[PDB]
């Protein structure tokens, strides 16, 4: 669909290459990052790599389904991390771009 094309060619394109994107390009690895409570707190992990694969593989049935996955990724970050953690500011920066681009997405 045209909305999913826009989410891939415009939204994901902008977010994937952003200088703050690197912590979000793959699933949170609780072992690598030393976060033994991560999966106790966050029950629906999400990341941009997964979203990008789903767009590439025509996994989504609706634009809002992809938008919900972006939202879950950012919301997980705000719920799990401390308010003062730098990753929170990175997520906020990327979410602002997501919303600005989504404001001009096609309607169908």
């Amino acid at each position: 669909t045209n909305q999913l094309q826009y989410l891939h060619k415009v939204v994901m394109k902008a977010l994937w290459k952003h200088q703050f994107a690197w912590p979000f390009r793959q699933p949170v690895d609780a072992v690598k990052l030393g976060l033994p409570d991560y999966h106790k707190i966050i029950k629906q992990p999400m990341d941009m790599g997964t979203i990008k694969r789903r767009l590439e593989n025509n996994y989504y049935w609706a634009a809002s389904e992809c938008m919900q996955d972006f939202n879950t990724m950012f919301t997980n970050c705000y719920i799990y991390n401390k308010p003062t953690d730098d990753i929170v500011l990175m997520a906020q920066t990327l979410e602002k771009i997501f919303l600005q681009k989504v404001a001009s997405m096609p309607q169908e």
Binding site: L35, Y80, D85, I87
Partner: peptide, 6 residues
């Protein structure tokens, strides 16, 4: 409330 990434 999580340990957090720093």
């Amino acid at each position: 409330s999580g340990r957090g990434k720093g």
